[PDB]
Amino acid sequence: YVNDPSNYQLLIKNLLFSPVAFNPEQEIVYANHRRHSYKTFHDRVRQFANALTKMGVKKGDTVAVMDYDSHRYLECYFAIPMIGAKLHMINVRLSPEQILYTIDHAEDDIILIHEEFLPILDQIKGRIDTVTRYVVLRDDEECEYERLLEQESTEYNFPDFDENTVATTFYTTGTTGFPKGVFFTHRQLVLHTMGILSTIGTNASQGRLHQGDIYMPITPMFHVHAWGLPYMATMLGVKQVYPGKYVPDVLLNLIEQEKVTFSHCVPTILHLLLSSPKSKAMDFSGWKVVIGGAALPKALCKSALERDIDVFAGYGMSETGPILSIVQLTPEQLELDVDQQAEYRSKTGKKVALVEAYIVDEDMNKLPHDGETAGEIVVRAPWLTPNYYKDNKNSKALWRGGYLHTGDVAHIDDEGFIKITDRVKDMIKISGEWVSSLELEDILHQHQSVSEVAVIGMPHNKWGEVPLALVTLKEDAQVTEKELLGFAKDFINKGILAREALLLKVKIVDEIAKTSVGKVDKKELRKLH
Amino acid sequence: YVNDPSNYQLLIKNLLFSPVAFNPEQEIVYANHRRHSYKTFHDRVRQFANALTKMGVKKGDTVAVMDYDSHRYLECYFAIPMIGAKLHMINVRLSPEQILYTIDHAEDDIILIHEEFLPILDQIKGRIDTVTRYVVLRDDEECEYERLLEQESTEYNFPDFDENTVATTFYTTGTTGFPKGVFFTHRQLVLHTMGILSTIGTNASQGRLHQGDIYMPITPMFHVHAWGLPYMATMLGVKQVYPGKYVPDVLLNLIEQEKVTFSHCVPTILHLLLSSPKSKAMDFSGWKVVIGGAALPKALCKSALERDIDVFAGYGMSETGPILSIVQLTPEQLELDVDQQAEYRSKTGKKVALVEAYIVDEDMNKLPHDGETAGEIVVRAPWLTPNYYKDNKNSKALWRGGYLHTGDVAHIDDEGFIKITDRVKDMIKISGEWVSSLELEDILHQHQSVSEVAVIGMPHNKWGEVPLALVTLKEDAQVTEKELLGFAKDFINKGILAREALLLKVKIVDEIAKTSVGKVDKKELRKLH
Amino acid sequence: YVNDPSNYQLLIKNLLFSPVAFNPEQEIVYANHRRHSYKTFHDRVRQFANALTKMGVKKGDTVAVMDYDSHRYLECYFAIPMIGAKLHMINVRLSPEQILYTIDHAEDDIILIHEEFLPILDQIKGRIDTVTRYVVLRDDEECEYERLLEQESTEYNFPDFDENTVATTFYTTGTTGFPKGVFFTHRQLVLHTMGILSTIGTNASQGRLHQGDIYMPITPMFHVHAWGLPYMATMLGVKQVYPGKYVPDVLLNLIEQEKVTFSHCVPTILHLLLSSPKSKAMDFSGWKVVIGGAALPKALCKSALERDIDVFAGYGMSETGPILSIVQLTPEQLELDVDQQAEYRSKTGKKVALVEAYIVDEDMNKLPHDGETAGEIVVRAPWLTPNYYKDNKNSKALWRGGYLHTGDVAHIDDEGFIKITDRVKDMIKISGEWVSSLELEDILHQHQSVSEVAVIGMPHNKWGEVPLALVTLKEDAQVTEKELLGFAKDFINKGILAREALLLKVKIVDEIAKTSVGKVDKKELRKLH
Ligand SMILES: Nc1ncnc2c1ncn2[C@@H]1O[C@H](COP(=O)(O)O)[C@@H](O)[C@H]1O
Ligand SMILES: Nc1ncnc2c1ncn2[C@@H]1O[C@H](COP(=O)(O)O)[C@@H](O)[C@H]1O
Ligand SMILES: Nc1ncnc2c1ncn2[C@@H]1O[C@H](COP(=O)(O)O)[C@@H](O)[C@H]1O
C-alpha cells in the first residue's frame, strides 16, 4: 500500500493510539480473575500481534473467536483488525449446525475457543475443513492464549492500509433460510465511535457517557461489537470491568465493588437484576443502563426508575452498526413524574448524528410524520453493511430503492420520537435470540397427524416473547400437547433447532381464522388465542 | 456481445443445430408415455425457450430441475443453456437438508420439480428464499410444463455470446463439510462431446458408439450430465429411449422392445438386471453397456460376458467432465478367453484424447509407470472445473501444484492401463452415492456411552461397499447393535443423514488397533474386522 | 506467456502427445527408403526442435518447406508449429515468379528445399532477400536435414502459448492478380482434427476412418495440410505410408505390399491408377479413397465401384480448413445397385459437424433448399481463415455479409445433399491447379493480330478441364493455331505462365456471341464451340 502521509486513513489503530484520553495507570478488570493497567494492555495487544504473525496470519485471513466477555475479547477487538486480518465473531447461542455453517461460510483459518465451549465443537469438529489451529482459552494460568502471548515481544509496527479493508464480520439469524453475514470496515467502525460519542457525550445532564465513567458490558460481546461500546470506552480511557459469564449475583457484586456507572443490557437481564434478593440493599443511584434488546416495557422502566437508575432505550440492529436511535430527555422532561418519565424513556428515541431514518410504505412513498401513520423504517448512515457476504438476491432486497430496509414498522412524532409498532413479518424473538416461525411450522407439520400449524408470538417478561403454536388435528386424531412438545424438542436435541424453542407452548384448536383470500389471520389469531 | 462472425464461439446451440447427422423422422421415446420425432423435439426446445423468456429468465439466471430421465430433462439440457441461463441439476438422492443447502447456495430463480418429489420439497419449502416459481411435472396431460410449452410459438432466435459463459452446475457430496459446486462452460461441454466422440467412435470393432446405435441411459441424469452421453447422442442423431424411474423389468422390456444397443450404468444396476428372472429368455447380444460407477468387479464382468454383452469400464468423476479414461481392447485382446477378457475389461482403462493423467506422490514427484508403484492421479484436460463455486481454500487444494487432484491412488502399466488401488481417504461409497465416515463417527460418538468409534468400508455386490462401524463401549456399558443402529437411523429420519446409512452394520469391539503414533489403523482394522 | 494451468489451450503438441491411441511400435514408412517406429518419430521431432532452436528460430519466425510427401514433411508439420514458429508450405507447381513472390510476401527465414527442386530455386535465388539459410534434402544419407538432426539430443520441453498463435500458412492462386495467403491457428487445426474425426469415425459401416486403418496420402501435402489427414492419422496412431513422388506403378506396389486401406486423391490420379496395366491383377477390396479435387465424375465412380473400392467424394477449399462436406451413405442406400451408388457417391455431400453452409443470392437472401434453385454457398465453421494475409479489400470481399463466400454455385436437396452447379466466375481448373482465363486472354491479346480473345473451359478426363481459347482474327489476318500456341508457350518458358497452359487448344473463329448489353456469352460460347 502506498501511504501518501498527507492522505489520512481512518483505522482502528488510530482509535487505540490516538485516543481522547490515555491514562497509563487506569485499570482493566476481569471479574475476580485479572487486573492490569492500560500500559500492559497496549503491550499485550502488541504481543498478540506478534503471536498472530508467527502463526502465519496474513492480511486477508480470518480469525474466529468463541468465548465470553473478558480482557481477551477486548484484545481481539484490536489486534486482529490492526494486523489487517478479519475478526469473525461467533454467536455461541446458535445451534451447532448453524455454528458449523457459519464457520464454513466465513472460511476461518484459526479458532480461539473457550474451554467450556469445547463440547459444542466436539460434535462438529469432524466437518470443519478450513481451520488449521485451535487455541483453547481458560481462566487460569493454563490458558493457551496466555502462554502464546508470553513468548513474544511487546514491540510491533502496525501496518497502514486502505481504510476500506474489512475489519469484522458476524452472522445474523434474522428470519431466512440460513444465517446471513454482515461486515464492516475500519472506516465504518471509527465513524460509528466518533458519531455516537458526539451524540451521547454532548448531552446536558442525563444519559451521557464521559471520561469519568466506569464501564461494564452486559451484552454478549459477539452481538454486533457489543453495540460498539468497548471501542468507545477505550477511546475515552475509562476503567473497564468485564464480568465473564452473566450471573446476576456476581454482576451485582461487581457493580457494587467496582463502582460501575455505565452499562448496557437487554430487558431480560435488567428484570433478573431487579428481581434478585441481593439487589434490595444496594445503591443503584449512579448507574446508567442503556436498554437496546427489544421494546423496553414501561412497567420495567418504572420499576427501574424507583431505584434511581438512569434507564433509557436505544434502537439498532445487526446490519446497522448497530446504533441508529437513542432517547435523550430535554431538561423540561427531566422534571416529569415517574409515569411520564417511564413513557418517554421506553420509546425507541431520536436518530443519532448522521442518520436519516425515513418512514415509507410498500411503494417507497415517504409517509408523513404525523405521529399515527405507520410504515417501515428505511435508513442511511455512514456505518451500514453494503450487502450480505456471498449473497446477491437478499442483498438486493436489503438495499431496495436506495435505502436500507430495517424490517420494522413504526411511526414518527413531530419532534422526532420513533415508536416501533411491529415487524414486517410474523417472526418471534425469544429473549435476545431470533427464532423463525415458518421453520417451526414446517417441523410441526412433519408430525404424524397435523391439519394446520400456525406459529404466532405472545409477550412475556422473563423472555419478552414466547413462540405460541396453534395446531389443528386431523380427522379422529387426538394427540396431547406433550406429544408435539417432545417432537419439537427432539429436533433441538439433534442440534437442528435453537434452544429458544424449549418454551414453545403449543395449543390445540379446531378452527383457523382466514382472510377473504384465505391467509391465516395471525393478528386476529393473536387476539383470539 | 459483439459477434465478429469470423470469430467462432463453441456453443451448445451449434451442437444441436450443426450435428454430425440429423434425420427429422428419427424418434425420441419416453417409456410407454410419449414418442416424437427430432423435428418436434427442435420445435419443443424453441417453445421452451419462449416460455422461459416469458417467465422473465435473463442471461445470468439459474433454473433448477428435479425429476427423472425423460424427454423434458433432455429439453432442459438444451433450452436453458442456449438462452444463456445456468442449469442447476439437483441430486434427488441427497438428504432434504443438503438439497435445501444446495438450492440456497446456487440461488435458483425457478424450480421444475416432478410430482412425486413434492414431499421432499414440502419439508423444506419454508426455508427457500430465492425461488419465485415452481413448475410441477407429471407424466400425463396434467403436466404444467406441457401446458406452458403449448402456449408458445415454435420460433426463436437463439443469442450468440461468449463461449466461456457458464452452462451447467451441480453439487458433489464428496467428503467435505458441505456439498461443493462444480460448473462447466459451453466450450467445455462442446469439447467433451467432440473429444469423447473421437475417442470411442474411431475404435475398430469393439465398444464403439456410432450413428446406427439406439441409446438408453441408466445413469440418473443429474449426475454430471449423464456422463455427457445425451449430448453425444443428439450430436449423432440416433434414436433415444428414456426409461423414467429405474425398474429392472420395465428396463428389460424397453431394451427388448426398442432394440437398445448402447447404455451406461453402475455395477449395482447391471447386477440387478442380470439377476432378474425376466433376463433369462432375452437376447443380450447387441448391447454395449459402459460401467463407470465404481470398480466393475471381475465376477460381474465374467457373468455379463457369458450373456454376449460388450461390457467395458470407464473412469471419471464430478470435477472432471466427467470422462477421463475408457478401456479399449486391441484386436489381439479380443480373442482371449472369458477370464482374461474379464480381467482386461474391468480395468479403469487408457486415457482419452487430450488427457494427461500423471501419477504423483505427496511431494508432487512423478512416479514411474512401472506397473506396481502407486500414487495419486493428477490430470489436465479441456473440460475440468476451474474451482469450486464460492470457495477459496478447497479450490486451492483442488488445483495444488498446477494439476487437478482426483483423490484416487492407482498404478499405471507400461502400455497405459490404469488400475485404481484405493482412495487418499477413509471414505465409503454405498452404491452410487457418497457417504462420509467422519460424520458417522461423530454421530455415533454423540451416543450415551461410547469410547472409540471408527467407521471403515467393506465390499459388497448389491451395494459395492457397506459402511462398517466399530464401536468400543465404556466401563461397565453394554448396548446392543440394535440400539446404535436405531440411534443412527433417527438422524436419517430427520433429514440429516442420507439413506445410504440404513445398512451401517455396526459391530462392538474392545480393542482398537493403533499405529506407532497412535492413529487408528483402518487398513489393519479392515483386515481384522 | 502466463500459463494458468486450469486454463486449457488447444495446441498441436496436445495433438501429438495426447493422442486417441499411441503404439510405440507402430511404423512410419517412406517408400522403399526408410522405416521407423512412432517412438523414433517422437525423438526425431524433439531433435528437429533442438536443431531449429540452434539455427536461431524464434516464436515469430517463418520456415518454408519445398519437397515431396515423406517423413520429413510429417516432422515439419509438428516441430515447426510446436516451437511457435510458422510453417509456410510452398506450392512447387506454381511458376517460378509466383513462387518467388510468395517467398518474398511471407518473409521466410529458413528454407528446406529438396534436391530436385534446386533448379527452380537457381533461377530466382538472386531476388530472394529475407532468407538466411537453405537446407538441401536428399533421399539418402547425404541429406542435410538428416545430418542436422543427428547432432542434437532427443530431449526438449515444448513451450505453451496462446492457442490463437498462427501455425501454418500457404498461398492460393485462385483467380486474382497475385496469390493470396491464408493462415490457420493451433486452435483451428486441433478443432478441424476433432470435428472431422467425429464426423467420419462415427459412421456405421461405410467410409469410416478408424484405429485399424493404414493411411497413405496421394494429395501433394502442400495443398491445405493434405486435407488435414496426416494430423488425423497421427491422432489415431495408425501406420502411415508416404510414397514420395507420385508414380502410378510404385503407388500400386505400395498399396499392395503395405496393405493400405485409406487414401485421398484427385480424380486424375484415380483415373491413372485404374488405367494402369499393373492394376488389373490387384485386390482393391479394402481401400477407401476420398476424392476431393473437383467434381468426381460418375463414370469414374462407376468404374471404381466395380473394383470393390469404397469411393466417396468430399468438398473443401484452401480458405476453409479445407473440409466442409463429405458424402455419407445411409444403410438403405448401401444396397442400391452400381448406377444409383455412383450417382450418390459423386455428390459433394452433407456438411460436417459444426458447419452451417447456406445458399444465397447476390443480395444475401437465403434461398430455399428445394433441390433445384441455385446460389452461391456461404459458410461458417470453426476453422476458416479470418482474412487474407496483408490484404484489406479482398479480405472484405471474402467475408461480405458476415459469411465466408466460397465462390461456388450449388443447390441443396431436402435431406441436405449439396450439388455444385458451377463457379461464380469464368475460370479454368486444369487437373489440381488453378489457371486464370483473364490472364490468358490478355497474353493472347498481346499478339500481333487479334480482334477478340475469349477463354472458356471444356471438360476432360485426364485433366478434368481444358482451357479452350477462341480468337477472332483482324482484317486480312491469317495465323495458324500453332503460332498462337507457341506464343503462349513462350511466356510459360519464361516462368510467367504456369505449365497447365500447355494444352490450351486455341481455336480460330469469326463471330463472337454477345449479350443484349454486349458481354461475351461464355455459356453460349461453350455450348457453341
Ligand atoms: N430499542 C428497540 N426497540 C424495539 N425493537 C428493537 C430495539 N433494539 C432492537 N430491536 C429489535 O431487535 C432486532 C435486532 O436484531 P438483529 O440486529 O438483526 O440481530 C432489531 O431488528 C429490532 O427489531
Ligand atoms: N471406473 C471407476 N473405477 C473406480 N472408481 C471409480 C470409477 N468411476 C468412478 N469411480 C469413483 O467414483 C467417484 C465419483 O465421485 P464424484 O464424481 O465426485 O461424484 C470417483 O472419484 C471415483 O473414486
Ligand atoms: N468435391 C468437390 N466438388 C466440386 N468442386 C470441388 C470439390 N473440392 C474442390 N472443389 C473445387 O476446387 C476448389 C479448390 O480450390 P482452392 O482450395 O482454393 O485452392 C474449390 O473452390 C472448389 O471449387
JSON list of N, CA, C and O in Angstrom, two decimals, chain A residues 104 109 123 126-127 129-130 176-178 390 393 438 442 446 487 491 494, chain B residues 104 109 123 126-127 129-130 176-178 390 393 438 442 446 487 491 494:
[
{"chain": "A", "resi": 104, "resn": "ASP", "atom": "N", "xyz": [-17.93, -22.60, 8.19]},
{"chain": "A", "resi": 104, "resn": "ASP", "atom": "CA", "xyz": [-17.57, -22.99, 6.82]},
{"chain": "A", "resi": 104, "resn": "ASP", "atom": "C", "xyz": [-17.77, -21.84, 5.84]},
{"chain": "A", "resi": 104, "resn": "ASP", "atom": "O", "xyz": [-16.96, -21.66, 4.93]},
{"chain": "A", "resi": 109, "resn": "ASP", "atom": "N", "xyz": [-9.40, -19.38, 9.43]},
{"chain": "A", "resi": 109, "resn": "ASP", "atom": "CA", "xyz": [-8.10, -20.05, 9.46]},
{"chain": "A", "resi": 109, "resn": "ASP", "atom": "C", "xyz": [-7.74, -20.53, 10.86]},
{"chain": "A", "resi": 109, "resn": "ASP", "atom": "O", "xyz": [-7.21, -21.64, 11.02]},
{"chain": "A", "resi": 123, "resn": "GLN", "atom": "N", "xyz": [-18.93, -31.99, 18.59]},
{"chain": "A", "resi": 123, "resn": "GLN", "atom": "CA", "xyz": [-19.95, -32.60, 17.75]},
{"chain": "A", "resi": 123, "resn": "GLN", "atom": "C", "xyz": [-20.01, -32.00, 16.35]},
{"chain": "A", "resi": 123, "resn": "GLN", "atom": "O", "xyz": [-20.88, -32.38, 15.56]},
{"chain": "A", "resi": 126, "resn": "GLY", "atom": "N", "xyz": [-15.51, -32.68, 13.20]},
{"chain": "A", "resi": 126, "resn": "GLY", "atom": "CA", "xyz": [-15.18, -33.52, 12.05]},
{"chain": "A", "resi": 126, "resn": "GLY", "atom": "C", "xyz": [-15.46, -32.84, 10.73]},
{"chain": "A", "resi": 126, "resn": "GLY", "atom": "O", "xyz": [-14.71, -33.01, 9.76]},
{"chain": "A", "resi": 127, "resn": "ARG", "atom": "N", "xyz": [-16.53, -32.05, 10.66]},
{"chain": "A", "resi": 127, "resn": "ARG", "atom": "CA", "xyz": [-16.99, -31.46, 9.41]},
{"chain": "A", "resi": 127, "resn": "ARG", "atom": "C", "xyz": [-16.38, -30.09, 9.14]},
{"chain": "A", "resi": 127, "resn": "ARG", "atom": "O", "xyz": [-16.86, -29.38, 8.25]},
{"chain": "A", "resi": 129, "resn": "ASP", "atom": "N", "xyz": [-13.28, -27.96, 7.70]},
{"chain": "A", "resi": 129, "resn": "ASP", "atom": "CA", "xyz": [-12.23, -28.18, 6.73]},
{"chain": "A", "resi": 129, "resn": "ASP", "atom": "C", "xyz": [-11.18, -27.08, 6.72]},
{"chain": "A", "resi": 129, "resn": "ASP", "atom": "O", "xyz": [-9.98, -27.37, 6.62]},
{"chain": "A", "resi": 130, "resn": "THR", "atom": "N", "xyz": [-11.60, -25.82, 6.81]},
{"chain": "A", "resi": 130, "resn": "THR", "atom": "CA", "xyz": [-10.68, -24.70, 6.60]},
{"chain": "A", "resi": 130, "resn": "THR", "atom": "C", "xyz": [-9.76, -24.45, 7.79]},
{"chain": "A", "resi": 130, "resn": "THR", "atom": "O", "xyz": [-8.68, -23.90, 7.61]},
{"chain": "A", "resi": 176, "resn": "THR", "atom": "N", "xyz": [-34.53, -16.19, 7.79]},
{"chain": "A", "resi": 176, "resn": "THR", "atom": "CA", "xyz": [-34.13, -16.53, 6.43]},
{"chain": "A", "resi": 176, "resn": "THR", "atom": "C", "xyz": [-33.83, -18.03, 6.43]},
{"chain": "A", "resi": 176, "resn": "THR", "atom": "O", "xyz": [-34.01, -18.72, 7.44]},
{"chain": "A", "resi": 177, "resn": "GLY", "atom": "N", "xyz": [-33.40, -18.54, 5.28]},
{"chain": "A", "resi": 177, "resn": "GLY", "atom": "CA", "xyz": [-33.03, -19.95, 5.22]},
{"chain": "A", "resi": 177, "resn": "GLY", "atom": "C", "xyz": [-31.83, -20.27, 6.09]},
{"chain": "A", "resi": 177, "resn": "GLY", "atom": "O", "xyz": [-31.84, -21.23, 6.86]},
{"chain": "A", "resi": 178, "resn": "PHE", "atom": "N", "xyz": [-30.79, -19.46, 5.99]},
{"chain": "A", "resi": 178, "resn": "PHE", "atom": "CA", "xyz": [-29.53, -19.65, 6.68]},
{"chain": "A", "resi": 178, "resn": "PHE", "atom": "C", "xyz": [-29.08, -18.32, 7.26]},
{"chain": "A", "resi": 178, "resn": "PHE", "atom": "O", "xyz": [-29.58, -17.27, 6.86]},
{"chain": "A", "resi": 390, "resn": "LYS", "atom": "N", "xyz": [-21.31, -12.94, 0.23]},
{"chain": "A", "resi": 390, "resn": "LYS", "atom": "CA", "xyz": [-21.54, -14.06, -0.69]},
{"chain": "A", "resi": 390, "resn": "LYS", "atom": "C", "xyz": [-23.03, -14.23, -1.00]},
{"chain": "A", "resi": 390, "resn": "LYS", "atom": "O", "xyz": [-23.54, -15.35, -1.06]},
{"chain": "A", "resi": 393, "resn": "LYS", "atom": "N", "xyz": [-29.32, -11.93, -4.14]},
{"chain": "A", "resi": 393, "resn": "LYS", "atom": "CA", "xyz": [-30.74, -11.58, -4.14]},
{"chain": "A", "resi": 393, "resn": "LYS", "atom": "C", "xyz": [-31.17, -10.95, -2.83]},
{"chain": "A", "resi": 393, "resn": "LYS", "atom": "O", "xyz": [-31.88, -9.93, -2.82]},
{"chain": "A", "resi": 438, "resn": "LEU", "atom": "N", "xyz": [-41.76, -19.88, 10.61]},
{"chain": "A", "resi": 438, "resn": "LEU", "atom": "CA", "xyz": [-42.01, -20.74, 9.46]},
{"chain": "A", "resi": 438, "resn": "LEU", "atom": "C", "xyz": [-41.32, -22.09, 9.62]},
{"chain": "A", "resi": 438, "resn": "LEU", "atom": "O", "xyz": [-41.89, -23.14, 9.28]},
{"chain": "A", "resi": 442, "resn": "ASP", "atom": "N", "xyz": [-43.06, -25.79, 9.77]},
{"chain": "A", "resi": 442, "resn": "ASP", "atom": "CA", "xyz": [-42.71, -26.95, 8.96]},
{"chain": "A", "resi": 442, "resn": "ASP", "atom": "C", "xyz": [-42.40, -28.16, 9.83]},
{"chain": "A", "resi": 442, "resn": "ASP", "atom": "O", "xyz": [-42.88, -29.27, 9.57]},
{"chain": "A", "resi": 446, "resn": "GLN", "atom": "N", "xyz": [-44.44, -31.77, 9.97]},
{"chain": "A", "resi": 446, "resn": "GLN", "atom": "CA", "xyz": [-43.86, -33.09, 9.75]},
{"chain": "A", "resi": 446, "resn": "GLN", "atom": "C", "xyz": [-44.34, -34.12, 10.77]},
{"chain": "A", "resi": 446, "resn": "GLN", "atom": "O", "xyz": [-43.78, -35.22, 10.84]},
{"chain": "A", "resi": 487, "resn": "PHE", "atom": "N", "xyz": [-41.90, -33.85, 20.38]},
{"chain": "A", "resi": 487, "resn": "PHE", "atom": "CA", "xyz": [-41.49, -33.97, 18.99]},
{"chain": "A", "resi": 487, "resn": "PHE", "atom": "C", "xyz": [-40.62, -32.79, 18.58]},
{"chain": "A", "resi": 487, "resn": "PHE", "atom": "O", "xyz": [-39.57, -32.97, 17.94]},
{"chain": "A", "resi": 491, "resn": "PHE", "atom": "N", "xyz": [-35.91, -32.39, 17.82]},
{"chain": "A", "resi": 491, "resn": "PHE", "atom": "CA", "xyz": [-35.11, -31.69, 16.82]},
{"chain": "A", "resi": 491, "resn": "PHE", "atom": "C", "xyz": [-34.05, -30.83, 17.48]},
{"chain": "A", "resi": 491, "resn": "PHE", "atom": "O", "xyz": [-32.90, -30.79, 17.03]},
{"chain": "A", "resi": 494, "resn": "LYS", "atom": "N", "xyz": [-31.00, -32.65, 18.54]},
{"chain": "A", "resi": 494, "resn": "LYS", "atom": "CA", "xyz": [-30.09, -33.03, 17.47]},
{"chain": "A", "resi": 494, "resn": "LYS", "atom": "C", "xyz": [-29.24, -31.87, 16.97]},
{"chain": "A", "resi": 494, "resn": "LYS", "atom": "O", "xyz": [-28.50, -32.04, 15.99]},
{"chain": "B", "resi": 104, "resn": "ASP", "atom": "N", "xyz": [-30.15, -23.03, -1.81]},
{"chain": "B", "resi": 104, "resn": "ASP", "atom": "CA", "xyz": [-29.83, -21.69, -1.32]},
{"chain": "B", "resi": 104, "resn": "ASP", "atom": "C", "xyz": [-28.48, -21.22, -1.82]},
{"chain": "B", "resi": 104, "resn": "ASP", "atom": "O", "xyz": [-28.31, -20.04, -2.16]},
{"chain": "B", "resi": 109, "resn": "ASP", "atom": "N", "xyz": [-33.71, -19.29, -9.43]},
{"chain": "B", "resi": 109, "resn": "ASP", "atom": "CA", "xyz": [-34.87, -18.43, -9.64]},
{"chain": "B", "resi": 109, "resn": "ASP", "atom": "C", "xyz": [-36.14, -19.23, -9.87]},
{"chain": "B", "resi": 109, "resn": "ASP", "atom": "O", "xyz": [-37.20, -18.86, -9.35]},
{"chain": "B", "resi": 123, "resn": "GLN", "atom": "N", "xyz": [-41.09, -30.34, 3.10]},
{"chain": "B", "resi": 123, "resn": "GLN", "atom": "CA", "xyz": [-40.42, -30.22, 4.38]},
{"chain": "B", "resi": 123, "resn": "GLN", "atom": "C", "xyz": [-39.24, -29.25, 4.34]},
{"chain": "B", "resi": 123, "resn": "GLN", "atom": "O", "xyz": [-38.54, -29.11, 5.35]},
{"chain": "B", "resi": 126, "resn": "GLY", "atom": "N", "xyz": [-40.45, -23.96, 3.27]},
{"chain": "B", "resi": 126, "resn": "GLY", "atom": "CA", "xyz": [-40.50, -22.74, 4.06]},
{"chain": "B", "resi": 126, "resn": "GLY", "atom": "C", "xyz": [-39.19, -21.98, 4.07]},
{"chain": "B", "resi": 126, "resn": "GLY", "atom": "O", "xyz": [-39.18, -20.74, 4.06]},
{"chain": "B", "resi": 127, "resn": "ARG", "atom": "N", "xyz": [-38.07, -22.69, 4.08]},
{"chain": "B", "resi": 127, "resn": "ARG", "atom": "CA", "xyz": [-36.75, -22.09, 4.22]},
{"chain": "B", "resi": 127, "resn": "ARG", "atom": "C", "xyz": [-36.11, -21.71, 2.89]},
{"chain": "B", "resi": 127, "resn": "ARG", "atom": "O", "xyz": [-34.91, -21.42, 2.86]},
{"chain": "B", "resi": 129, "resn": "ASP", "atom": "N", "xyz": [-35.77, -19.03, -0.09]},
{"chain": "B", "resi": 129, "resn": "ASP", "atom": "CA", "xyz": [-35.96, -17.59, -0.22]},
{"chain": "B", "resi": 129, "resn": "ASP", "atom": "C", "xyz": [-35.87, -17.11, -1.66]},
{"chain": "B", "resi": 129, "resn": "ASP", "atom": "O", "xyz": [-36.67, -16.26, -2.08]},
{"chain": "B", "resi": 130, "resn": "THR", "atom": "N", "xyz": [-34.92, -17.62, -2.44]},
{"chain": "B", "resi": 130, "resn": "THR", "atom": "CA", "xyz": [-34.64, -17.07, -3.76]},
{"chain": "B", "resi": 130, "resn": "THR", "atom": "C", "xyz": [-35.67, -17.48, -4.81]},
{"chain": "B", "resi": 130, "resn": "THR", "atom": "O", "xyz": [-35.85, -16.76, -5.80]},
{"chain": "B", "resi": 176, "resn": "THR", "atom": "N", "xyz": [-16.65, -33.78, 2.56]},
{"chain": "B", "resi": 176, "resn": "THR", "atom": "CA", "xyz": [-16.33, -32.42, 2.99]},
{"chain": "B", "resi": 176, "resn": "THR", "atom": "C", "xyz": [-17.40, -32.01, 3.99]},
{"chain": "B", "resi": 176, "resn": "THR", "atom": "O", "xyz": [-18.28, -32.81, 4.34]},
{"chain": "B", "resi": 177, "resn": "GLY", "atom": "N", "xyz": [-17.32, -30.78, 4.48]},
{"chain": "B", "resi": 177, "resn": "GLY", "atom": "CA", "xyz": [-18.35, -30.30, 5.39]},
{"chain": "B", "resi": 177, "resn": "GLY", "atom": "C", "xyz": [-19.71, -30.20, 4.72]},
{"chain": "B", "resi": 177, "resn": "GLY", "atom": "O", "xyz": [-20.72, -30.67, 5.25]},
{"chain": "B", "resi": 178, "resn": "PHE", "atom": "N", "xyz": [-19.75, -29.60, 3.54]},
{"chain": "B", "resi": 178, "resn": "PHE", "atom": "CA", "xyz": [-20.97, -29.35, 2.78]},
{"chain": "B", "resi": 178, "resn": "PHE", "atom": "C", "xyz": [-20.73, -29.73, 1.33]},
{"chain": "B", "resi": 178, "resn": "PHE", "atom": "O", "xyz": [-19.59, -29.88, 0.90]},
{"chain": "B", "resi": 390, "resn": "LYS", "atom": "N", "xyz": [-17.93, -20.33, -5.18]},
{"chain": "B", "resi": 390, "resn": "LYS", "atom": "CA", "xyz": [-17.97, -19.59, -3.92]},
{"chain": "B", "resi": 390, "resn": "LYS", "atom": "C", "xyz": [-17.06, -20.22, -2.87]},
{"chain": "B", "resi": 390, "resn": "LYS", "atom": "O", "xyz": [-17.41, -20.32, -1.70]},
{"chain": "B", "resi": 393, "resn": "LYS", "atom": "N", "xyz": [-10.36, -21.95, -0.26]},
{"chain": "B", "resi": 393, "resn": "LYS", "atom": "CA", "xyz": [-9.34, -22.86, 0.25]},
{"chain": "B", "resi": 393, "resn": "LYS", "atom": "C", "xyz": [-9.44, -24.24, -0.38]},
{"chain": "B", "resi": 393, "resn": "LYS", "atom": "O", "xyz": [-8.43, -24.83, -0.77]},
{"chain": "B", "resi": 438, "resn": "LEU", "atom": "N", "xyz": [-16.38, -39.82, 8.66]},
{"chain": "B", "resi": 438, "resn": "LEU", "atom": "CA", "xyz": [-16.13, -38.95, 9.80]},
{"chain": "B", "resi": 438, "resn": "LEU", "atom": "C", "xyz": [-17.43, -38.45, 10.42]},
{"chain": "B", "resi": 438, "resn": "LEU", "atom": "O", "xyz": [-17.55, -38.38, 11.65]},
{"chain": "B", "resi": 442, "resn": "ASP", "atom": "N", "xyz": [-18.77, -39.07, 14.23]},
{"chain": "B", "resi": 442, "resn": "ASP", "atom": "CA", "xyz": [-19.22, -38.05, 15.18]},
{"chain": "B", "resi": 442, "resn": "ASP", "atom": "C", "xyz": [-20.62, -38.36, 15.70]},
{"chain": "B", "resi": 442, "resn": "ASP", "atom": "O", "xyz": [-20.88, -38.28, 16.91]},
{"chain": "B", "resi": 446, "resn": "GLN", "atom": "N", "xyz": [-21.74, -39.17, 19.60]},
{"chain": "B", "resi": 446, "resn": "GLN", "atom": "CA", "xyz": [-22.75, -38.45, 20.38]},
{"chain": "B", "resi": 446, "resn": "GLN", "atom": "C", "xyz": [-23.67, -39.39, 21.16]},
{"chain": "B", "resi": 446, "resn": "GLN", "atom": "O", "xyz": [-24.70, -38.93, 21.68]},
{"chain": "B", "resi": 487, "resn": "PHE", "atom": "N", "xyz": [-30.24, -45.43, 16.85]},
{"chain": "B", "resi": 487, "resn": "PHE", "atom": "CA", "xyz": [-29.78, -44.07, 17.11]},
{"chain": "B", "resi": 487, "resn": "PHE", "atom": "C", "xyz": [-29.32, -43.40, 15.82]},
{"chain": "B", "resi": 487, "resn": "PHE", "atom": "O", "xyz": [-29.66, -42.24, 15.56]},
{"chain": "B", "resi": 491, "resn": "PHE", "atom": "N", "xyz": [-31.31, -40.01, 13.10]},
{"chain": "B", "resi": 491, "resn": "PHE", "atom": "CA", "xyz": [-30.78, -38.85, 12.39]},
{"chain": "B", "resi": 491, "resn": "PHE", "atom": "C", "xyz": [-31.22, -38.85, 10.94]},
{"chain": "B", "resi": 491, "resn": "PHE", "atom": "O", "xyz": [-31.60, -37.81, 10.40]},
{"chain": "B", "resi": 494, "resn": "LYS", "atom": "N", "xyz": [-34.65, -37.55, 10.35]},
{"chain": "B", "resi": 494, "resn": "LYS", "atom": "CA", "xyz": [-34.80, -36.10, 10.45]},
{"chain": "B", "resi": 494, "resn": "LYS", "atom": "C", "xyz": [-34.29, -35.37, 9.22]},
{"chain": "B", "resi": 494, "resn": "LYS", "atom": "O", "xyz": [-34.27, -34.13, 9.22]}
]
